[PDB]
Design a protein around this nucleic acid. Structure first.
Lengths: 171, 182
RNA sequence: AGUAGAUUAGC
RNA sequence: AGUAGAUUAG
């Protein structure tokens, strides 16, 4: 089957009223839910303002993301690809961005190589190979979910060779 | 439509210093087609650095090569391992040989057969141990699995996600009680 | 002494 | 409390 982590969305900005039951009845419009939970404060039992929805298939996850915007219990909420507990500890893991850093490209790698591999994740806006070639490049998408789909994957083969993918940064 | 290059690549450690790209190739193409084969050399001396990489066309061929250990290349037994990505190679101890993994993030209803059901596919299991807290009696949220061949572990840690009992869980090479307090 | 690729952070 | 799951080191 497909790994649980790839079938899970993080839902940001929940209302205090939002429950496992209310969250479920909304997001089950886009598929079957293997799990649906609001994270609550262990001591107060207040909602902590976010939850998780898990579909049976990644297709259903994709459908829910394609049906943005999402309003739950009177509140616009923010669904994003669920970053694993391990990757969540890395700085910038949770930023909403449209641009990725691509490092480890070989010297004969051209722009159409990068386009051929990254098209599958979403509409590409801009590709820029760094010149001085220094072995890295930048790709800009029009939808942050395109980036999120990319960084939850481990390997990326461009022109027959692995390369590392990171969210592009401000500093 | 291939399989990622990183999963098709083996690190070959301990090469004879006379081994070349071609001699390394003629040995390892006995187990399949090689999309690449290289001896790593020092940039200034051009001398061999004592290790290389071979990449097969399919991971199936990688498995065949690993199942044919030991491998003697140009008179010397070499040590082939799953090629750890440059990114993962930067963390301490990434290349140490272990048969035992730490498994963290298992739910309270996760049983011993759940762990065995998922990890069997990587190799013969020797020992599974779910950690229960003394003084409380219930599960602590992690476990340990011991395999019979380190390559089983190496095949596990080059994958990203591991769904045990319907939930993701993290896998790390196990360190000793001493090594951890440090 | 030894078996981890290093041209993987933009003007 | 209010947008990252600490029951993830024996």
């Amino acid at each position: 089957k497909e790994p649980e982590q790839l079938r899970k969305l993080f839902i940001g900005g929940l209302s205090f009223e939002t429950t496992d039951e209310s969250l479920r009845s909304h997001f089950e419009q886009w598929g079957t839910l293997t799990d649906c939970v609001v994270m609550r404060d262990p001591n107060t039992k207040r909602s902590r303002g976010f939850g998780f929805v898990t579909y049976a298939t990644v297709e259903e996850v994709d459908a829910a993301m394609n049906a943005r915007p999402h309003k739950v219990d009177g509140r616009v909420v923010e669904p994003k690809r669920a970053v694993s507990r391990e990757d969540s500890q890395r700085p910038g893991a949770h930023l909403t961005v449209k641009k990725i850093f691509v490092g480890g490209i070989k010297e004969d790698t051209e722009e159409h190589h990068l386009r051929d591999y990254f098209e599958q994740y979403g509409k590409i806006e801009v590709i820029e190979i760094m010149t001085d070639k220094r072995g890295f490049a930048f790709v800009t998408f029009d939808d942050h979910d395109s980036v999120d789909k990319i960084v939850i994957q481990k390997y990326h083969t461009v022109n027959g060779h692995n390369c590392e993918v990171r969210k592009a940064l401000s500093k």
